[PDB]
Design a binder for this molecule. Structure first.
Ligand SMILES: [Zn+2]
Ligand SMILES: [Zn+2]
Lengths: 228, 225
């Protein structure tokens, strides 16, 4: 029955609880779309959540605050309406504010699984074998591999080849994610990388230790071995 | 020695200088793209595939500023990887079952976002009311959004309207992008009808009040015309 928390004065990543009545709380979080208030209702010996705190950060803090102050498990949650509170790496860069660049293929692929995010189009990379200059690097589309849209980045000044998830480290002996991968085209796409960058001295995989051009041959062998 | 990602503490990002103006950035994720590139562009920096997640990306930017001291002006994504997570995704990963009306989940589909797992039936018509656990769900009709629900806690006579209800201090309509300004006052009337016994009303933002918040909200929306 005291001072209700003003959302703007709650630090980033923190959430306040306000008990309205027995087994009824309101949770308040910073509101950087302005919904700062939500509800916590006791459900027997469990808790029902109404409109969780905005964002992944605040929701995690909400659950932690609930456990600390109430000590009852949150088993169910209701969204009263739709609000896109998703934040990723590109969103943090956008607010930095760094301009993010992506191929049309990548952007169109983002649409099917969630975007609306402003990005700039990287033209001239729609066909396998295409290569364009972007600032201090060269962008290369080898074709489908780990994903239908994966690009390769080469740094000519240092002869450094970054293959992303399309390239494995030496210690990786079996194919990983593969869900969005074209296992058939993957070795062919690697061949295009090998032919277009024979001068590469430093090859960086998506995960793990860097190596030489042997990473390309290694990745192709692992993917091929993922057959029948 | 090049950092093995599994031996990097949680929430930390490493920078490995390969050559002049060329760094790799390594983040931990054994639970998963761990490597990325930083290439010097004149007196600026070009970022290749920022670290996975909002937290690591922020730590990456901080580490870049601390160690290199040059501004990141552009960033390239080599491929789409969904590290964009919201509240529903955290709830789902923590073992919390998420619920929403078919209308809300249908709206969720049209944006490719994270759909609440289970459907809340019996709320497709204006005036509909169902019980869900310790609360009553009420669909007043279109207001702040086509799908907005009202939550009533009968044991405490507490009314929660979400963004469909303003606090007293709000004298102008805010986020009204998906709002039906014409139906909003009518939908509010239905709320007033179904819950005249409500003692505490919680707005989507700001201080709680009584049933006067309903009247107040309708006045603000009408004044927007
Ligand atoms: Zn809201
Ligand atoms: Zn990938």
């Amino acid at each position: 029955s005291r001072e209700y928390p003003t959302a703007s004065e709650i630090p980033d990543g923190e959430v306040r609880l306000y008990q309205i009545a027995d087994g009824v709380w309101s949770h308040i979080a910073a509101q950087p779309a302005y919904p700062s208030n939500g509800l916590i209702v006791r459900d027997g010996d469990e808790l029902l959540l109404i409109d969780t705190a905005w964002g992944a950060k605040n929701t995690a803090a909400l659950l932690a605050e609930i456990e600390k102050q109430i000590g009852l498990p949150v088993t169910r949650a209701v969204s009263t309406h739709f609000h896109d509170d998703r934040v990723g790496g590109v969103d943090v860069l956008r607010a930095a504010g760094v301009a993010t660049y992506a191929s049309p293929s990548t952007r169109r692929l983002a649409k099917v699984e969630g975007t609306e995010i402003p990005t700039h189009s990287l033209e001239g990379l729609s066909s396998s074998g295409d290569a364009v200059r972007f600032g201090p690097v060269e962008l290369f589309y080898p074709g489908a591999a780990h994903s239908p849209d994966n690009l390769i980045v080469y740094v000519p000044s240092a002869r450094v080849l970054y293959g992303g998830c399309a390239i494995y480290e030496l210690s990786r002996t079996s194919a990983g994610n593969v869900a969005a991968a074209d296992l058939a085209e993957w070795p062919t796409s690697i061949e295009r990388i090998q032919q277009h960058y024979p001068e590469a001295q430093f090859v960086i995989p998506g995960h793990g230790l860097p190596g030489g051009l042997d990473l390309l041959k290694h990745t192709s062998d692992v993917v091929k071995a993922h057959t029948n």
